[PDB]
From Swiss-Prot, chains A, B, C:
Residue(s) of cross-link: Glycyl lysine isopeptide (Lys-Gly) (interchain with G-Cter in ubiquitin): 6, 11, 27, 29, 33, 48, 63
S-S bridge residues: none
Protein name according to UniProt: Ubiquitin
Function field: Exists either covalently attached to another protein, or free (unanchored). When covalently bound, it is conjugated to target proteins via an isopeptide bond either as a monomer (monoubiquitin), a polymer linked via different Lys residues of the ubiquitin (polyubiquitin chains) or a linear polymer linked via the initiator Met of the ubiquitin (linear polyubiquitin chains).
Domain Ubiquitin-like: 1-76
Site feature: Interacts with activating enzyme: 54, 72
PTM statement from Swiss-Prot or TrEMBL: Phosphorylated at Ser-65 by PINK1 during mitophagy. Phosphorylated ubiquitin specifically binds and activates parkin (PRKN), triggering mitophagy. Phosphorylation does not affect E1-mediated E2 charging of ubiquitin but affects discharging of E2 enzymes to form polyubiquitin chains. It also affects deubiquitination by deubiquitinase enzymes such as USP30. Mono-ADP-ribosylated at the C-terminus by PARP9, a component of the PPAR9-DTX3L complex. ADP-ribosylation requires processing by E1 and E2 enzymes and prevents ubiquitin conjugation to substrates such as histones.
Residues of the full protein shown: 1 to 76 of 156
Positions where Phosphoserine occurs in the chain: 65
Residues bearing the modification ADP-ribosylglycine: 76
Cellular compartments annotated: Cytoplasm; Nucleus
Site feature (Essential for function) residues: 68
Cross-link named Glycyl lysine isopeptide (Gly-Lys) (interchain with K-? in acceptor proteins), sites: 76
């Protein structure tokens, strides 16, 4: 399925995922695609910060959903 | 979860914490992030000075809460 | 807890104490903080001169209370 991840620069990352993907795997995909270390990523769906060890399906994230990506810089 | 720590310079420190964190751990995070030794820090939530050996959950500190940080200089 | 000790110069010393602290310990804190030997210090709470061997709790001294400090010079 596709999901859309809006970033703070105003760019949207289109990802191909499965509901069975952990949030940690989603952050690995963003590291692929945008070069951002997972440690810096905070993913938000429906106002909730997503937990690395949970899956997209735990959050009821369906095809064509929108997430937000906030970056936390180390030492910030 | 995030908490917001207002400092006396007017700057707000955004921290990532757990309710299971001791106040001592919160002060270690502030030492990370701002370079302030824990010994100098006095943390205030809801008008109460927080005790190092207690947890955020003991104080019912919830996500997105605001604390204040006062600094006590040694010999002051 | 904090207590406030007004001195005869018009300066107020803010101290961190416990109700379990003896008056002798409070005078040691003032010696730290202001350089005044305990022998010179006379502490006053609620019109009463405080006895070294008693505790703040014996006097019902609560957080944010005000004391006065009078100095007795030796040979005076």
């Amino acid at each position: 399925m596709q999901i859309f991840v809006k970033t703070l620069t105003g760019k949207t990352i289109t990802l191909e995922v499965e509901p069975s993907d952990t949030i940690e795997n989603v952050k690995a995909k963003i590291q692929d695609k945008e070069g951002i270390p997972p440690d810096q990523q905070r993913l938000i769906f429906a106002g909730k910060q997503l937990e690395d060890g949970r899956t997209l399906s735990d959050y009821n994230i369906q095809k064509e959903s929108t997430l937000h990506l906030v970056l936390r810089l180390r030492g910030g």
